Symmetry: C2
Subunit: 452 residues, 2 copies
């Protein structure tokens, strides 16, 4: 899609809803879920706290605190994955992912690991107990962790693991592993370094599903590859898997996840169109004094190999259903109106999640078959229509609830007339007038929007 | 996708196949089918002849000639739709579409109509009988007729009807009806002028299916709208509907047909990206003296209103699975390598059909879940892979069988190791060096390609 302007974003006020702050000043609230107990559950990424809010009374309880979660003040690491077992009454488990110290680490630049872990809910004590590590030794870094964890209708864990920020900023010269897959030797040795920029599919005990796809003949936990920062993952009622992912200066994506599909990153951003992006591989640069011009590979400094999207030799490439946004080679990536925070002016929205609207007895008129996608850098929640079979999008991404807030997650109540949203504690956002602010209207909040 | 160069098309010779010409000098051969009798059936658009070819010997028989078919030497009209009933042993019917005179036409510039008609096959006389018009009074013109007719697994007729050429060449100033929908009053009066740029879905008796989608509050024969020239239509084994369509100077498309979808034409060509196309509506120009610069709306003469793809207020817009091809605004639509035949160098392939390859006992290795798309202007047959659920394409459109021929249709034998192809009798094609020729290697042919490892 074509970018909306700052004035088009500012007009998305959503006057048909009443706003109410439920909780404020949470410490990096991250995942939000409607619980099997009809209460709202949420996580704090920084502390490892798991919270439960009563939707009728607003009271909150710290149900459990995941011990030894590692979070850097300048990092996107900490407590990430969060999901209930789908048959909770008959299977009382909570599945999480988190950043923990790796005692075997030799590399001081990468001291941590990611672990997918199960907890059992104890109703008599109203807390979590009996931790079970399902999959450990997963890559960890300060950037592009992703970590969305869902249980599919096939009763398998689906888990997004980002590209770890390789080929940009502090990890500029590290070789991106999104296209890489494990050898049989690495898999046998539990060497999961290639589990970067993937959607994993695991058995509920953490083992490899016997029906997982193969890559170079190897059947590992990998379900799809070629992802950058997929922070959104959601099943539709008819069993399709929708996803949102942050692109670089352009081409954030809405994807349809298909078994064994290659989503093209870093060789391809968005469509394979050679429009506004090219792959500049800094890990293959002449030396580390080379600068990243931050022109999305359209223009590069001397000494860095660069390839067109159309020149990539990859197989099973799956294009996105929608891009937010695609631009031409003439686009200006050096907009001074954003000051030092140049990235805020880039033609992207930074999707933080993806939620399939289920409807209900008080459903909002015209919201059937929609996907809701919160935006961090624009301070809007997008509404994306699909056809009833979730095979294609219909029309464009409609912005809603414009505010000077970084929207982190969204859910709706069972009746469908109330939306609940999480907002970041701190960071940069685009104001109504297109400039940048770090003065957030509702830092670290749980906000309620009731249809009127 | 990004356009392939002349050198990339030239290398696509497909040395893995043996070529055998079965017939040549056919009179505008159009549709090709593998029949219920395991024989090859094909139509002649110009004559209205329905021919049957024995695959073993290569002998041909004229089974029937549809009477009073209208065809102009400078037109794409004539005998179009052609399909068998899927349970032919219990229902020996053949469904066709064709251009016929409209006796109620007042407009001398548009004297014809399109009719969807059923015939009964008589085994004892080996000919077609008992004609019955299913749906008549459909639009007809010399351009963008399309006319692909298939029977779905729901046993409904699916029919493509093009935009009639409105907003280009001889029909430049006519208002394009691709986005237009009929009123209840018009349906009640069997007034089908809005049936241009559509995929129709009809009951076998030609009536409106009760479960057809609604457009602007009316359920008609319309299944999808917003199409330009959709010449390809094919069902997948899991019941999905794939389609190919000719775009203007850019953005020919492979579409997934979704019930009630709006495919964007003429407001959107390909993706809604404002890249290499804008909608210049000549029917809303100041007067009929305004010239079309043929720059795909990027650059226009003064006096024509232009709407960007992003400025259109649309409902249910469905983007294509793949474009052949998408270019940026800086693209030069006046390539001197094509001389005076400028249209052959435009970033398009002019897809003529779409065929779902089903494999079989002798399936070609690596061709699972592929869609075969013949190209008229490039002289190739594209192989496009999809995932096993036919939900997305995988990779790019792979060119095959490069020759100086206009490929019109393609089918495969039940074993899957043999392809049968139709070529046009006359027209322009791009050569190996990128230039244009009207010297066709195999004019109006039926060609057999046999796989070899
Ligand atoms: Ca991608
Ligand atoms: Ca791209
Ligand atoms: Ca951001
Ligand atoms: Ca009308
Ligand atoms: Ca279209
Ligand atoms: Ca376009
Ligand atoms: Cl190895």
């Amino acid at each position: 899609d074509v970018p909306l302007t700052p004035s088009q974003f500012a007009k998305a006020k959503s006057e048909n809803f009443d706003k109410k702050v439920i909780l404020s000043n949470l410490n990096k609230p991250h995942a939000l879920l409607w619980g099997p107990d009809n209460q709202i559950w949420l996580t704090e990424r920084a502390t490892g706290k798991i919270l439960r809010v009563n939707p009728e009374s607003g009271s909150v309880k710290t149900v459990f605190q995941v011990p030894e979660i590692v979070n850097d003040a300048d990092g996107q690491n900490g407590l990430l994955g969060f999901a209930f077992h789908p048959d909770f009454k008959n299977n009382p488990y909570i599945y999480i992912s988190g950043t923990f110290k790796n005692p075997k680490s030799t590399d001081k630049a990468l001291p941590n690991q990611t672990i997918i872990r199960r907890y059992t809910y104890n109703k008599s004590t109203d807390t979590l107990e009996k931790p079970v590590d399902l999959l450990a030794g997963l890559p960890s870094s300060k950037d592009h962790q992703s970590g969305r964890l869902v249980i599919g209708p096939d009763q398998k864990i689906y888990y997004t693991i980002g590209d770890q920020g390789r080929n940009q900023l502090a990890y500029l010269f590290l070789p991106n592993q999104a296209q890489h897959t494990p050898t049989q030797q690495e898999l046998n040795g539990k060497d999961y370094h290639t589990y970067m920029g993937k959607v994993l599919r695991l058995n509920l005990d953490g083992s490899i599903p016997k029906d997982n796809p193969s890559f170079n003949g190897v059947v590992s936990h990998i379900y799809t590859l070629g992802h950058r920062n997929p922070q959104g993952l959601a099943f539709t009622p008819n069993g399709k898997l929708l996803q949102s992912e942050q692109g670089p200066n352009s081409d954030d994506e809405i994807n349809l996840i298909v078994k064994g599909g290659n989503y093209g990153w870093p060789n391809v951003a968005g469509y394979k169109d050679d429009s506004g992006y090219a792959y500049a591989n800094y890990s293959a640069a002449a030396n580390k004094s080379i600068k990243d011009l931050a022109q999305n590979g359209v223009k590069v400094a001397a000494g860095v190999p660069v390839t067109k999207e159309s020149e990539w030799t990859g197989k099973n490439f799956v294009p996105p259903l929608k891009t937010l946004y695609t631009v031409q080679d003439t686009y200006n990536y050096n907009d001074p109106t954003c000051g030092e925070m140049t990235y805020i002016c880039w033609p992207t929205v930074a999707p933080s999640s993806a939620y399939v609207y289920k409807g209900g007895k008080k459903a909002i008129t015209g919201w059937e078959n929609t996907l809701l996608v919160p935006s961090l850098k624009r301070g809007v929640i997008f509404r994306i229509k699909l056809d009833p079979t979730y095979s294609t999008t219909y029309d464009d991404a409609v912005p809603m609830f414009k505010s000077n807030n970084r929207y982190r997650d969204v859910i709706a109540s069972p009746d469908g007339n109330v939306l609940y949203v999480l907002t970041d504690t701190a960071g940069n956002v685009q104001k109504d007038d297109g400039s940048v602010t770090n003065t957030l209207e509702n830092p670290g909040s749980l906000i309620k929007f009731t249809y009127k």
